[PDB]
Design a protein around this ligand. Structure first.
Ligand SMILES: CN(C)Cc1ccc(-c2cnn3c(-c4cccc(NC(=O)c5cccc(C(F)(F)F)c5)c4)ccnc23)cc1
Length: 262
């Protein structure tokens, strides 16, 4: 099929996000759309490649818990168009406006996140940068997973969600389904405490050193009292320092659905 969108069709509006490599606007196209542009007028074969790669991954996705890809264009600027998300990222709710969700709602958000991630892995897609920033609460109800970073091509990294093996860079490719399961383990942490790991350490190099060497791990005792035992237990299995000791999403998704019904 053809997901190309001729120029002219989209009416670009308010700018909503600026980054090193590309800018995102709100747009008009048979309704509301989000449009991530490139801005750089002359694209190097470097960027023209990563464009194809991203699009290629997106068009493989058809799930309610994954940001809905809608089209792209190359006409004047490289651009990718997606469903328009009304609301805020989970990060925003949790650590910026500190929205207080009910325990039932928190568990729900976890389940939807698992669903999407199950789907992504089933389609052979390793996210590599799961984190509360990349989880949108569409209309404060539906979880949409995406990649909303306007930087990385490695760039920086938010190392809070990074698994010990990724922090340690042995092997060219340390990323795996379990490394994604670890990031998710951190997301659970955020949900069940309302906090970011290692809030009390102000040195990024030491967190990296200590996490990778095994000396440091999220303070599990900060989990709210009303948080179900089955949940904490699952959360702990996801954050195991040893890769092959972590569960995969079918098993995780099962565990969440099971503990949700009580
Ligand atoms: C709120 N502030 C922090 C400002 C602010 C910051 C960022 C954004 C923002 C950044 N991109 N983007 C998008 C967007 C647009 C086009 C493409 C994408 N590709 C993905 O999603 C993507 C890419 C690869 C894999 C996957 C995955 F998921 F694996 F399938 C998803 C996102 C839509 C809406 N909004 C944003 C907006 C405001």
């Amino acid at each position: 099929d053809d997901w190309e969108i001729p120029d002219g069709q989209i009416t670009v509006g308010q700018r909503i996000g600026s980054g090193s490599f590309g800018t995102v606007y709100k747009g008009k196209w048979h309704g509301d759309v989000a449009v991530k542009m490139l801005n750089v007028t002359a694209p190097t074969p470097q960027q023209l490649q990563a464009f194809k790669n991203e699009v290629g991954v997106l068009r493989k996705t058809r799930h309610v818990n994954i940001l809905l890809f809608m089209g792209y264009s190359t006409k004047p600027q490289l651009a990718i168009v997606t469903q328009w998300c009304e609301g805020s990222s989970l990060y925003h709710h949790l650590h910026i406006i500190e929205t207080k969700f009910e325990m039932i709602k928190l568990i729900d958000i976890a389940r939807q996140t698992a669903q999407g991630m199950d789907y992504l892995h089933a389609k052979s897609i390793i996210h590599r940068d799961l984190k509360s920033n990349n989880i949108f609460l569409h209309e404060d109800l539906t979880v949409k997973i995406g990649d909303f970073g306007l930087a990385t091509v490695q760039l920086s990294g938010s190392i809070l969600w990074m698994a010990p093996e990724v922090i340690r860079m042995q092997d060219k490719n340390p990323y795996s389904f379990q490394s994604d399961v670890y990031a998710f383990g951190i997301v659970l942490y955020e949900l069940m405490t309302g906090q970011l790991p290692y809030s009390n350490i102000n040195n990024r190099d030491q967190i990296i050193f200590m996490v990778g060497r095994g000396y440091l791990s999220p303070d599990l005792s900060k989990v709210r009292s009303n948080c179900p035992k089955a949940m904490k237990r699952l959360m702990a299995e996801c954050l195991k320092k040893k890769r092959d000791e972590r569960p995969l999403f079918p098993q995780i998704l099962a565990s969440i659905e099971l503990l949700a019904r009580s």
